[PDB]
Amino acid sequence: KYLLSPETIEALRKPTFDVWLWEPNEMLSCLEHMYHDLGLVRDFSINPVTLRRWLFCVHDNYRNNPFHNFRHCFCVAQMMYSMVWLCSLQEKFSQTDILILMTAAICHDLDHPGYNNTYQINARTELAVRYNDISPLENHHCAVAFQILAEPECNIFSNIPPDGFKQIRQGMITLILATDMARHAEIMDSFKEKMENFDYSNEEHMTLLKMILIKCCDISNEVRPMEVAEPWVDCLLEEYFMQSDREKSEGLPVAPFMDRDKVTKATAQIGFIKFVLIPMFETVTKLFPMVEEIMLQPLWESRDRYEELKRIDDAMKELQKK
Amino acid sequence: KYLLSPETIEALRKPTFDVWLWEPNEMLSCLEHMYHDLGLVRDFSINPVTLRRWLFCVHDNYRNNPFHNFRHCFCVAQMMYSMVWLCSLQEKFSQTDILILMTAAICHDLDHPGYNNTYQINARTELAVRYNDISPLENHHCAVAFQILAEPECNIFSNIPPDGFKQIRQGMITLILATDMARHAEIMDSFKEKMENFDYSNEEHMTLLKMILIKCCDISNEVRPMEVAEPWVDCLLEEYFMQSDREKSEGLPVAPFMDRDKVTKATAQIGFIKFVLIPMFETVTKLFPMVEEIMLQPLWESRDRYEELKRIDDAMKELQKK
Ligand SMILES: C[C@@H](Nc1nc2c(cnn2C2CCCC2)c(=O)[nH]1)C(=O)N1CC[C@H](F)C1
Ligand SMILES: C[C@@H](Nc1nc2c(cnn2C2CCCC2)c(=O)[nH]1)C(=O)N1CC[C@H](F)C1
Ligand SMILES: [Mg+2]
Ligand SMILES: [Mg+2]
Ligand SMILES: [Zn+2]
Ligand SMILES: [Zn+2]
């Protein structure tokens, strides 16, 4: 049953929203609500019907991978929606910037194949050869994003003038490309430097803030409730094993964190929560104090839980080895 | 024709080479000779039969556009060859670096359509949407170069280890992407920054020098003798007029420097020589003083010759005025 209850629309605004509850049509409708509710339909004369066909286009072009699937895209877009409200971003950003933040979130892993950059490059694929080993998947995601938008029936921007299309497009590209974890250190070091004296009337500081926001949402699964978050780790590792199978039986290098024999659910997250998630949301909390209690808080609770799980896993491996 | 005379082999080593005398047959055999003579076939275990097939395929993947054709390809690699000897590059650069320089120069405009990046982006071409407005032609040149090299019958790198291939791929990519003239000032400023106190054991200083070197060869046509240089100006304007005419009938922006109402042969070369070519070769001359007499001298004469021809143009216009 598409058509959402008023209870659902309420829940949808917070990062506690149970993303697993809903089937695709309900998620499409949830996303459709977001565009209306943020005033993007109103302020960019988006045809209400074109909006629905666009979300169906997008959905069709996400794949049935275990992790990089349409449900991931909904998580990231819904988490961006939560962040608009939590941080009150309509006070600091234009409606163009919100449109970029939302449309980039929805489009940022379009047609992900289930194998990451390092596979693409080492196997010398169609995509690595096409994009010269430079963020190949991330370029592919934008390419597909705008190939969808070039179809008149899927074009939510059809009544935006050329200058505004040009600005959105640039913005969307900057953000979708920023999702490549290869650049996490570079992007964070850029941001932290700008943060020494932040200025919202500085376009360059704001371009970085948006980059950090989409990144925050992209890797945001562990910010959610333990019940909601925990199943994404199986989805990740299942996808990661799929690749490291292929890498072994093709003789390509294998990343320790994708190695069946090495990684566990617990050791996948301890490091990620501690040295990627926590520091990123720590920096962002300076700019938005309310982030601490809502987002940084479940990250401490997740860190503490996954370190306990490791103590039990490790204790259990003392029984196994011969 | 093919089977090059000892005289042709000697004249091929210098910037004075009459690039117009030779049909595709002979230019290929020349390029081939360059690889044997520079010790690239020897030092990289290149199969000389594969070398011939690669070159035929490269040549096949250049288009019959007025300016950006196989002959332009030949000029850039031939000018690179000249510079190797003039600047004694084998005393400063590794054989791997020479391989990167020659192979990049040959490959740098593969499958160029005859309309520049500004066309691609304003007409929203497959290429522009594919490459996210980011140097769409240059990325595509690289893409075509390594599609070709992925075919085993065209693969001149087939006996190089993977480590070496990765290093060459990366190097060629940097160079080909450096030929986008939109980055000329950025690249020159980055080069000039290092040039304050240059260092050949600094790998980044070298990476820029190689970017400058291919840039020099890419736009070097005015360095060649005045009989050889001048018909290339007609080829250029023919291509640019072909684009400005399309831009006019398609309702797209037109660039003054490409307008067939506004631009003369002389106005097309004066600014370009005085403010792009000359300062670039001036900066190279500091590192290689011998460049002044052999390359900056013909540029000076061409500037003078074209500045005089504008004074003729301008006085003929004053008689026209009624
Ligand atoms: C085992 C892996 N753990 C991990 N990776 C994630 C999450 C979300 N997204 N991702 C990647 C990165 C973006 C796409 C999928 C997450 O909750 N945990 C890790 O530590 N790393 C660190 C390097 C790499 F980012 C994965
Ligand atoms: C009229 C044009 N003149 C010009 N352009 C050239 C030459 C060689 N290569 N090129 C371009 C560089 C990339 C494509 C071919 C040359 O001898 N003269 C100009 O003034 N400009 C201003 C900058 C723009 F690149 C061309
Ligand atoms: Mg991704
Ligand atoms: Mg070019
Ligand atoms: Zn993602
Ligand atoms: Zn060129």
Does ligand 1 come within 6 angstroms of the Cβ of A223? no
Q: Which of B136, B137, B81, B84 is CA-nearest to residue B108?
A: B137
Q: How close, in Å, is residue A122 to chain B by CA atoms? A: 9
Cβ <8 Å between A129 and B139? no
Does ligand 2 come within 6 angstroms of the Cβ of B257? yes
How far is residue B122's CA from residue B118's CA, in Å, rounded to a whole number?
A: 6
Measured between beta carbons, which residues in chain B are less than 8 angstroms from residue A147?
129
Residue found under tokens 């940084």: A296
Nearby residues for ligand 4 (ion, Cβ within 5 Å)? B 109
How far is residue B47's CA from residue A163's CA, in Å, rounded to a whole number?
A: 53
Q: Which domain holds residue A109?
A: 1-322
The 3 state secondary structure assigned to chain B is CCCCCHHHHHHCCCCCCCHHHCCHHHHHHHHHHHHHHCCHHHHCCCCHHHHHHHHHHHHHCCCCCCCCCHHHHHHHHHHHHHHHHHCCHHHCCCHHHHHHHHHHHHHCCCCCCCCCHHHHHHCCCHHHHHCCCCCHHHHHHHHHHHHHHHCHHHCCCCCCCHHHHHHHHHHHHHHHHHCCHHHHHHHHHHHHHHHCCCCCCCHHHHHHHHHHHHHHHHCHHHHCCHHHHHHHHHHHHHHHHHHHHHHHHCCCCCCHHHCCCCCCHHHHHHHHHHHHHHHHHHHHHHHCCCHHHHHHHHHHHHHHHHHHHHHHHHHHHHHHCC
CA of B136 to the centre of ligand 5 (A): 25
A245 within 8 A of A270, measured Cβ to Cβ: no
Q: Provide the b/e sequence for A301-312 (b: ≥16 CB within 10 Å).
A: ebbebbeebbee
Which are the catalytic amino acids of A? 68
Residue A110 Rama label (left phi>0; alpha psi -120 to 50; beta): beta
Measured between beta carbons, which residues in chain B are less than 8 angstroms from residue A169?
133
- Ligand 2, atom 23, lies closest to the CA of B272
Cβ <8 Å between A139 and B129? no
Closest atom of ligand 2 to CA, residue B67: 15
CA of A196 to the centre of ligand 5 (A): 29
Which experimental approach was used here?
A: X-ray
How far is residue B80's CA from residue B13's CA, in Å, rounded to a whole number?
A: 10
Q: How many domains does the structure of chain B reveal?
A: 1
Residue A18 Rama label (left phi>0; alpha psi -120 to 50; beta): beta
Kindly report the CA angle at A251 between A246 and A253, in degrees rounded to 5? 85
Q: Is the dihedral of CA A151, A156, A159, A160 positive or negative?
A: negative
Q: How close, in Å, is residue A174 to chain B by CA atoms? A: 10
The 3 state secondary structure assigned to chain A is CCCCCHHHHHHCCCCCCCHHHCCHHHHHHHHHHHHHHCCHHHHCCCCHHHHHHHHHHHHHCCCCCCCCCHHHHHHHHHHHHHHHHHHCHHHCCCHHHHHHHHHHHHHCCCCCCCCCHHHHHHHCCHHHHHCCCCCHHHHHHHHHHHHHHCCHHHCCCCCCCHHHHHHHHHHHHHHHHHCCHHHHHHHHHHHHHHHCCCCCCCHHHHHHHHHHHHHHHHCCHHHCCHHHHCHHHHHHHHHHHHHHHHHHHHCCCCCHHHCCCCCCHHHHHHHHHHHHHHHHHHHHHHHCCCHHHHHHHHHHHHHHHHHHHHHHHHHHHCCCCC
Residue found under tokens 């080593």: B13
Q: Is A222 exposed, middle or buried (0-12, 13-18, 19+ CB in 10 A)?
A: buried
A284 within 8 A of A212, measured Cβ to Cβ: yes
How far is residue B3's CA from residue B6's CA, in Å, rounded to a whole number?
A: 10
Other CB atoms within 10 Å distance of the CB of residue A185: 10
Q: Report chain B's terminal Cα–Cα distance, integer Å.
A: 55
Q: Which of A135, A136, A34, A117 is CA-nearest to residue A75?
A: A34
Q: Which of A99, A188, A180, A97 is CA-nearest to residue A141?
A: A180
How far is residue B169's CA from residue A129's CA, in Å, rounded to a whole number?
A: 10
Other CB atoms within 10 Å distance of the CB of residue B256: 10
Q: Which residue of B132, B135, B137, B151 is the best one to mutate when testing the A interface, meaning the one whose CB has the most A CBs within 10 A?
A: B132
Q: Which of B100, B280, B273, B108 is CA-nearest to residue B190?
A: B280
Q: Tell me the CATH number at B295.
A: 1.10.1300.10
B60 within 8 A of B31, measured Cβ to Cβ: no
Does ligand 1 come within 6 angstroms of the Cβ of A178? no
Residue found under tokens 């023919």: B238
Residues 6+ apart with CB under 8 A from B10: none
Q: Is B205 annotated in the active site?
A: no
Does ligand 2 come within 6 angstroms of the Cβ of B278? no
